[PDB]
Structure 1
Amino acid sequence: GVFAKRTMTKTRRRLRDLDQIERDLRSPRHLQQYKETKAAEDLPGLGLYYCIECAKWFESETSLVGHRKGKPHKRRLKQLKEGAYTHEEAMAAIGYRIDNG
């Protein structure tokens, strides 16, 4: 189930993008940036229990190990195995390159 599915596509209901998840997994600095863009006291579990794969905070470690079995987590793992879509792939689709001398 999706909560309030009618307004799911609004800009104020936007979620983190998969290429951002790729950059967070590759480099910790972007993930840290996404951490100070939030307030630690209002996060579920005070921000200690966070799944980078699903970009989601959880109230407890048992809840985290709980969602890791779920098919949303496995779909996120599958999507990250196939790889996110980027501007480099967009240029390679049309055969475009960047000339830097």
Structure 2
Amino acid sequence: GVFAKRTMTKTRRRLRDLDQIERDLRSPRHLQQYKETKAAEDLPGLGLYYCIECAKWFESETSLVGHRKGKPHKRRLKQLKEGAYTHEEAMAAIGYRIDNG
């Protein structure tokens, strides 16, 4: 279940987007910027156990290995395999392009 599903769509309850997840997977600098926007001592497991695919911190290595068997992690894997939706795909959907000369 979802904790406090009534206010799930509030901006203060927002979660990291899938295109950001792909960019974190592709380049470690973008992931490092996202991690520098956080505080290490206030994270589960002091930030040592992180799932990039779910964009989620975990209290222990066995907890990370545990959620990997779950279906939300597999949903994130299949969504990343399909590919997230970007502005390039948005322009290709309407047949629009960029002319740089």
TM-score of the pair, normalised by structure 1: 1.00
What corresponds to 2:24 in structure 1?
A: 24
Residue 82 of structure 1 and its aligned partner are, at CA, apart by 0.2
Residue 96 of structure 1 and its aligned partner are, at CA, apart by 0.2
Residue 7 of structure 1 and its aligned partner are, at CA, apart by 0.1
Structure 1 runs, 4 residues or longer, greater than 6 Å off: none
Q: How far does the alpha carbon of each residue in 1:8-64 deviate from its partner, in whole angstroms, 9 at most, with x for none?
A: 000000000000000000000000000110000000000000000100000000000
Distance 1:58 1:45 in 2: 6
Count of aligned positions: 101
Distance 2:32 2:10 in 1: 26
Distance 1:60 1:73 in 2: 16
> Any unmatched runs of 5+ in structure 1?
none
Q: Could you say what secondary structure the match of 2:67 adopts?
A: helix
Q: Percent identity?
A: 100
Residue 85 of structure 1 and its aligned partner are, at CA, apart by 0.2
Matches within 5 A, 1:81-96: 81-96=81-96
> Any unmatched runs of 5+ in structure 2?
none
What corresponds to 2:59 in structure 1?
A: 59
Residue 89 of structure 1 and its aligned partner are, at CA, apart by 0.1
